Ligand binder design. Structure first.
Ligand code: NI
Lengths: 30, 21
């Protein structure tokens, strides 16, 4: 695997791919 | 946080797994 530059909706897409049915929390800073 | 690191810098898929449930 390689490192990634992920902003906005692209980060959410990656979380979805990584976590799949486990689900995930998307928790941005204030 | 991660949202921030991945965007301002870079992050790995392994770091993202930290956010799975
Ligand atoms: Ni885009």
């Amino acid at each position: 695997f390689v490192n990634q530059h992920l902003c906005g909706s692209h980060l959410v897409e990656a979380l979805y791919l990584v976590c799949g049915e486990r689900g995930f929390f998307y928790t941005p800073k204030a | 946080g991660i949202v921030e690191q991945c965007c301002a810098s870079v992050c790995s898929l392994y770091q993202l797994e930290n956010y799975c449930n």
